[PDB]
C-alpha cells in the first residue's frame, strides 16, 4: 500500500517500555501480566534490552486486546484465522502489539490459543523481526503449540543482527 513506516525499524534505546491498555476476560489479569512478562523475558535474555511496564500511553509498545475493527485500520477476523498482529519499532503506532479477543486465550494445555506463545511471536515483530521461513522457528508465520523452548537459531540470529 501507500502506508510507510518511519525509521530503520529497530529500537535505539535499551529500556523498552510497555503499556497494557486493556485485558481479555479469558484469564486472570495477573496471569495475563505474567504471560506477557515471560514473553518479554525470552527476548531480554538474548538482547541488551530490558522491558519495563508503564501505566500511560507514553510507552514504546502499547498492548491491546481488540475485536474486528479496533482502531488501526487493520481489523481482526473473529474466531481463529488471524490471532494477533504487531508493528515494527519506531514512533506512534510503531512498536505496538494487538491480540484478537474473539479468540479464547489460554496458557499451555488450555483449550484455546497460548497467549504466551502468541505474545512471544508478536513481541518479536515489535522488536524488529520479520517472519521466518524456518518451520520450527518462533517467527514462522503459522501458530503451532509447543511445550519445548520457543526460540530457535534463526530467531536468535535475526535478533542479534538487530541488537548485537
Amino acid at each position: 500500500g501507500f502506508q510507510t513506516f518511519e525509521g530503520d525499524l529497530k529500537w535505539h534505546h535499551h529500556n523498552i517500555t510497555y503499556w497494557i491498555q486493556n485485558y481479555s476476560e479469558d484469564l486472570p489479569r495477573a496471569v495475563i501480566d505474567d504471560a506477557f512478562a515471560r514473553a518479554f523475558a525470552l527476548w531480554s535474555a538474548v538482547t541488551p534490552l530490558t522491558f519495563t511496564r508503564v501505566y500511560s500511553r507514553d510507552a514504546d509498545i502499547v498492548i491491546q486486546f481488540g475485536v474486528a475493527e479496533h482502531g488501526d485500520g487493520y481489523p481482526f477476523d473473529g474466531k481463529d484465522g488471524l490471532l494477533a498482529h504487531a508493528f515494527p519499532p519506531g514512533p506512534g503506532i510503531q512498536g505496538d502489539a494487538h491480540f484478537d479477543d474473539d479468540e479464547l486465550w489460554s496458557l499451555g494445555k488450555g483449550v484455546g490459543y497460548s497467549l504466551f506463545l502468541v505474545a512471544a511471536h508478536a513481541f518479536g515483530h515489535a522488536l524488529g523481526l520479520d517472519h521466518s521461513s524456518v518451520p520450527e522457528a518462533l517467527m514462522y508465520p503459522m501458530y503451532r503449540f509447543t511445550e519445548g523452548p520457543p526460540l530457535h537459531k534463526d530467531d536468535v540470529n535475526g535478533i542479534r543482527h538487530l541488537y548485537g
Binding site: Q3, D72, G81, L83, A84, D130, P141
Partner: peptide
C-alpha cells in the same frame, strides 16, 4: 501494515 500471526 502490521505483520500477523495465523492459526491453521
Amino acid at each position: 501494515x502490521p505483520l500477523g500471526f495465523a492459526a491453521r
